[PDB]
RNA sequence: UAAGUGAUCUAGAAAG
RNA sequence: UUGCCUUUUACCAGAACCAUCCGGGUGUUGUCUCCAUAGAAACAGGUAAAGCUGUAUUUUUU
């Protein structure tokens, strides 16, 4: 099974952050992933590539569309990896 | 424990106690009183060794037979074990003989 | 494998955001393992509305942000 | 009875002797003993009677020794079983039962 | 094969049987670790005016509860108190039979 | 020792220290009947030895169903329900004397 | 209608 | 502190400290015995055998 998805489930309720094919990031506490990436944040902010800011409550995003998903430094100690 | 495992420790001829499981155990119903009674001495000297722990000497590797090979006095044979008994027999003898005879008293 | 968890989501407003910068509105009524979304239709992002009840396909969505929290 | 905890009963107000005169200081005061008695007095009447508890037992002998336990039962002053549940496959009879306690 | 089968003639029960001079009585008997000071001086405590005597409080319940039934208990251990063993084993040259004991429901 | 009756040690006793439990000692427990036959003949010797309120309970159990009438049935005001209370209450006592 | 189960110390040799 | 006892040793049996002993491991050396003797191989990849992975139509690569 796939480590990343592994990575992504376990990152779950940290404040991640979640950027799409389109360009706009996003910076949240995650709520829930599957095997495809199909994830959801709560409390999220979300910045296009202009620079404008829009707060928002609950976002449910798609792992195709999504680009890259960055996780906070701490999953990089445990545990997980072995 | 004797034969739940399959490896183990020798212990000595001494250090086995089969009579011991049968006083540790319940007595057999329909014994007469004396049987009893000797069950019961025997699970009180149990009982008592149980209870004051001598734990042995930490220093003392020095066993008595050791030190006596260690000297050039001592030789060792294999031997028969009722010749062994034999000569004990016979030592023995010579010196509890040799000792009463220096004592003076030779009658 | 798995089906997605929109029971949340279930009977909400959710603003679709789908492909080419465009938007979809309406109350949610359904959905499958393609994350193909069923919605009771509403206006495109002034606003206007098109078809009682909508069938979005999967590829499409970019997003679904949830109107009602 | 033994100024021990009272249980499984009512406290119905049949009449209430209050003076004329009112002060809160004796009204109250006098009340929380003077209840306490009657009620003592409503328990007398009601011919009162000691509840001791029973625990509810559980015994899981093997199939063999029920009787032994029924015998055992039968020595203690109350004592019930009610059921010898089989616990299907093993030897054992778990005993519902009472036994005050 | 059983463990449970020495209830009251473990090491720790002889233990506080010779603590509590208490023989059980298929088990061994000491001097006291105590001198019996009876001087209790008819006091209001343990009286047979003020007790119930429903139970007998045998000896056997002594070294089992040391430190309840047993009143000022001194150098008494603790005693296990243990699950019941079913384990049984053929006899006749059979294997794996349910032989002593009874059938599910279903 | 066992039941607390064992002599307390072998030594010095100058005996076995052996105990018999006495069958006189059943005989003492059981008289239970022996003491019918006293206490029996004693008990044979000494052999042969509000309204108000019930009224009060029903008046208040009357009116209480009539609150709940009152519930069930068209009284938001608690006059109406006072009043038609008061009426069973006067009636009840009417009744009673 | 129910009696009667069990608790069992010891234990010799010298000199005086 | 008890008990047999009346003197002690030799003893009774419990307690508290203590020791002695009969043994036990473990580790490190050193020996004693019985069997034995090679100072260099991986890389380009084959030949053969052992360890694990695999079996284009919406979320990865058609
Ligand atoms: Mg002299």
């Given at each position: 099974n796939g480590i990343p998805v592994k990575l992504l489930n376990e990152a779950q309720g940290h404040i991640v952050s979640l950027e799409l094919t389109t360009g706009a990031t996003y910076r949240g506490k995650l709520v829930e992933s599957e095997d495809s990436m199909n994830v959801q944040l709560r409390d999220v902010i979300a910045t296009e590539p202009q620079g404008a800011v829009t707060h928002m409550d609950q976002i449910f995003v798609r792992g195709s569309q999504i680009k890259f998903i960055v996780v906070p430094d701490l999953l990089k100690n445990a545990p997980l990896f072995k | 424990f004797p034969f739940n495992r399959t490896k183990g420790k020798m212990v000595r001829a001494q250090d086995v106690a089969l009579a011991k499981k049968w006083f540790l155990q319940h007595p057999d119903e329909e014994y007469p009183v004396k049987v009893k009674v000797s069950y019961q001495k025997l699970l009180k000297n149990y009982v008592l060794n149980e209870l004051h722990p001598t734990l042995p000497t930490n220093?003392?590797?020095?066993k008595l037979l050791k030190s006596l090979k260690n000297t050039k006095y001592f030789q060792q044979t294999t031997i028969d074990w009722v010749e062994a008994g034999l000569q004990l027999c016979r030592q023995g003898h010579n010196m509890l003989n040799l000792l009463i005879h220096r004592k003076g008293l030779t009658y | 494998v798995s089906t997605p968890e929109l029971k949340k989501y279930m009977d909400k407003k959710i603003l679709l955001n789908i492909n080419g910068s465009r938007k979809v509105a309406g109350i949610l009524r359904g959905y499958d393992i393609f994350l193909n979304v069923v919605l009771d239709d509403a206006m495109e992002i002034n606003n206007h509305q098109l078809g009682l009840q909508t069938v979005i396909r999967?590829?499409?969505?970019?997003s679904l942000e949830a109107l009602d929290a | 009875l033994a100024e021990e905890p009272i249980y499984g009963v009512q406290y119905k107000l049949l009449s209430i002797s209050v003076p004329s005169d009112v002060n809160i200081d004796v009204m109250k005061s006098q009340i929380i003993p003077l209840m306490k008695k009657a009620c003592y007095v409503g328990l007398l009447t009601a011919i009162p009677i000691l509840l001791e508890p029973i625990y509810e037992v559980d015994i899981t002998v093997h199939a063999p020794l029920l009787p032994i336990v029924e015998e055992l039962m039968k020595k203690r002053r109350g004592s019930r079983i009610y059921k010898t549940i089989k616990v299907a496959?093993?030897?054992?009879?778990?005993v519902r039962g009472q036994v005050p306690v | 094969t059983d463990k449970n089968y020495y209830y009251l003639f473990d090491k720790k029960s002889f233990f506080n049987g010779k603590a509590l001079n208490?023989?059980?009585?298929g088990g061994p008997k000491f001097?006291?670790?105590?001198?019996?000071?009876?001087?209790?001086?008819?006091?209001?405590?343990?009286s047979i005016d003020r007790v119930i005597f429903r139970?007998?409080?045998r000896s056997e319940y002594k070294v089992a509860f040391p430190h309840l039934?047993?009143?000022?208990?001194?150098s008494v251990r603790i005693p296990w108190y243990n699950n019941p063993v079913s384990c049984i084993i053929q006899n006749?040259?059979?294997?794996?039979?349910?032989?002593?004991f009874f059938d599910p429901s279903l | 020792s066992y039941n607390g009756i064992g002599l307390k040690s072998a030594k010095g006793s100058s005996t076995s220290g052996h105990v018999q439990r006495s069958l006189a000692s059943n005989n003492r427990r059981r008289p239970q009947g022996s003491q019918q036959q006293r206490q029996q003949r004693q008990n044979a010797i000494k052999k042969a030895s509000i309204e108000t309120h019930m009224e009060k309970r029903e008046i208040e159990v009357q009116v209480s169903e009539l609150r709940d009438r009152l519930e069930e049935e068209e009284?938001?005001?608690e006059e109406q329900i006072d009043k038609k209370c008061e009426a069973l209450r006067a009636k009840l006592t009417n009744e009673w004397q």
């Open positions: - | 220093h003392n590797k020095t | 999967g590829n499409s969505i970019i | 496959g093993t030897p054992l009879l778990e | 208490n023989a059980i009585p001097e006291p670790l105590y001198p019996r000071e009876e001087e209790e001086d008819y006091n209001e405590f343990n139970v007998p409080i039934y047993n009143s000022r208990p001194r006749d040259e059979e294997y794996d039979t349910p032989a002593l | 009284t938001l005001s």
